[PDB]
Swiss-Prot record:
GO biological process: bone development; negative regulation of canonical Wnt signaling pathway; negative regulation of Wnt signaling pathway; protein depalmitoleylation; regulation of bone mineralization; Wnt signaling pathway
Organism: Homo sapiens
One term under GO cellular component: extracellular region
Protein name in the entry: Palmitoleoyl-protein carboxylesterase NOTUM
Swiss-Prot/TrEMBL keywords: Glycoprotein, Hydrolase, Phosphoprotein, Secreted, Serine esterase, Signal, Wnt signaling pathway
Hydrolase listed as a keyword: yes
Main location: secreted
Span covered, complete protein: 88 to 451 of 496
Gene: NOTUM
Family affiliation: Belongs to the pectinacetylesterase family. Notum subfamily.
Length: 351
C-alpha cells in the first residue's frame, strides 16, 4: 500500500481548490524513485468541466480520496509483479487538475476551477526532497494516458527544478505510457462545435488558454505564441527534450482511435493500417520504445503488464535494458516496435 499525503502547500490544489497530494511507499536504502502521473482525459471549458465534476469528481478533487492505494504493475513492490523496479520508492500522483498536467492557474474571482498540474508535480518533488528524495540517484517520472503526455510536458522541468535546488546528481528520466498521440486526420470529421465534436488539437488549443497551460521551453520557442498545442504531441515535443525518455505506446491506442472517431470494410481497414504505420514511423528514431501492435490503452500500472512482449522481449525486460544502457547490449534491446500491421497480430496482446 501507498499512503496518502496531502500537499503541505495548500495553495497547490485540485480543480475545486481542495489540496492536491501524492501516495507514497518508501523503500529504505533504495536510491531509485518512481513518480507516476495518473491519466484520465481533461476538460477545457466551464460546461465540460462542470460535467466532469458531477461524475468524475475524484479527477477534480481530493475530498473523497482514500487514505491508501495498492501499488500495481510498475508501482508494485513484489518482484513477481514488478521485475523492473520492485524495490524503488513508489509515488502515485493522482490526476486532479484535468489539464494534461500542464496548468498553472489558481481558482480565483475570474476562474471557477484551478488548473495546477504543472505546479502539482513541482510541489510533490519539493516535498519529497525532505522525505528521502534528496538522496536519490534516479528519479523516473512515469505516467499513463494523459499522464504519459504529462511526462513529456514535465520531465525536463523536474530536471531543471532539481538542478536549481542544488541536486545535480539526481538523474531525471521519463517513462511515457499511452501518451504519444498523432494529430492525424479523423476517420469521420466534425467541426469543433461541442465537446464530442472537438478534435484534440482544437480542444488542447482551447484548454491551454483556459488552464494557463505551460509546455517545455525549447518546444515553446520552436512553435511560439498560439501554437503551444503542438507540444502536446509526442513526435513534436520529444526531439526538444534533454532528459532520457522511454516511450510505451500501443500502435492502435484506444484513446487515439476515439479522437479519430473510430468505433471492417476497406476504407476503415486502410485507415487503421495507416494509423499503425504512422505511429511506427514516429518511433523510428526513438531509441527507447516499446510499441506492440495491439488495440488497447495503458500498460505500466496493470497487474499483468509483464505479459506483453515485442520480438520476444517483455516491457519490464526492456526497461531493465534501458537502465543498463544509461550506466548496444547483447540480447538486451531497448527499441521494440512491432512491424505487423493489424491489431492483435502480436499474440501477446491483452485479451
Ligand atoms: C506554494 O505554491 C505556490 C504555487 O506553486 C508557490 O508560488 C509558492 O511559493 C509555494 N509556497 C511555499 C511556501 O512553498
Ligand atoms: O487520458 C486518456 O485516457 C487519454 S488523454 C488524450 N487522449 C488522446 C489525445 C490527447 C490526449 N491528451 O491527454 O493529450
Amino acid at each position: 500500500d501507498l499512503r496518502l499525503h496531502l500537499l503541505l502547500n495548500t495553495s497547490v490544489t485540485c480543480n475545486d481548490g481542495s489540496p492536491a497530494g501524492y501516495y507514497l511507499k518508501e523503500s529504505r536504502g533504495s536510491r531509485r524513485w518512481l513518480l507516476f502521473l495518473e491519466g484520465g482525459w481533461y476538460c477545457f471549458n466551464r460546461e465540460n468541466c462542470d460535467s466532469r465534476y458531477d461524475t468524475m469528481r475524484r479527477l477534480m478533487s481530493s475530498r473523497d480520496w482514500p487514505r491508501t492505494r495498492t501499488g500495481t504493475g510498475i508501482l508494485s513492490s513484489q518482484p513477481e509483479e514488478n521485475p523492473y523496479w520492485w524495490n524503488a520508492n513508489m509515488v502515485f500522483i493522482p490526476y486532479c487538475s484535468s489539464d494534461v498536467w500542464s496548468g498553472a492557474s489558481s481558482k480565483s474571482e475570474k476562474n471557477e476551477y484551478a488548473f495546477m498540474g504543472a505546479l502539482i508535480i513541482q510541489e510533490v518533488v519539493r516535498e519529497l526532497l525532505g522525505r528521502g528524495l534528496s538522496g536519490a540517484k534516479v528519479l523516473l517520472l512515469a505516467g499513463s494516458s494523459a499522464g504519459g503526455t504529462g511526462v513529456l510536458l514535465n520531465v525536463d522541468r523536474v530536471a531543471e527544478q532539481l538542478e536549481k535546488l542544488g541536486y545535480p546528481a539526481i538523474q531525471v528520466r521519463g517513462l511515457a505510457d499511452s501518451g504519444w498521440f498523432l494529430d492525424n486526420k479523423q476517420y469521420r470529421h466534425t467541426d469543433c462545435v461541442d465537446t464530442i465534436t472537438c478534435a484534440p488539437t482544437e480542444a488542447i488549443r482551447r484548454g491551454i488558454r483556459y488552464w494557463n497551460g505551460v509546455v517545455p521551453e525549447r518546444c515553446r520557442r520552436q512553435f511560439q505564441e498560439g501554437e503551444e498545442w503542438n507540444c502536446f504531441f509526442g513526435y513534436k515535443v520529444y526531439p526538444t527534450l534533454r532528459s532520457p525518455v522511454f516511450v510505451v505506446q500501443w500502435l492502435f491506442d484506444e484513446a487515439q482511435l476515439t479522437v479519430d472517431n473510430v468505433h471492417v470494410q476497406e476504407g476503415l481497414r486502410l485507415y487503421i493500417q495507416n494509423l499503425g504505420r504512422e505511429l511506427r514511423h514516429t518511433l523510428k528514431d526513438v531509441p527507447a520504445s516499446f510499441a506492440p501492435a495491439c488495440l488497447s490503452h495503458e500498460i505500466i500500472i496493470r497487474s499483468h503488464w509483464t505479459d506483453v512482449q515485442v520480438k520476444g522481449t517483455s516491457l519490464p525486460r526492456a526497461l531493465h535494458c534501458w537502465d543498463r544502457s544509461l550506466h548496444p547490449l547483447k540480447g538486451c534491446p531497448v527499441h521494440l516496435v512491432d512491424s505487423c500491421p493489424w491489431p492483435h497480430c502480436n499474440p501477446s496482446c491483452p485479451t
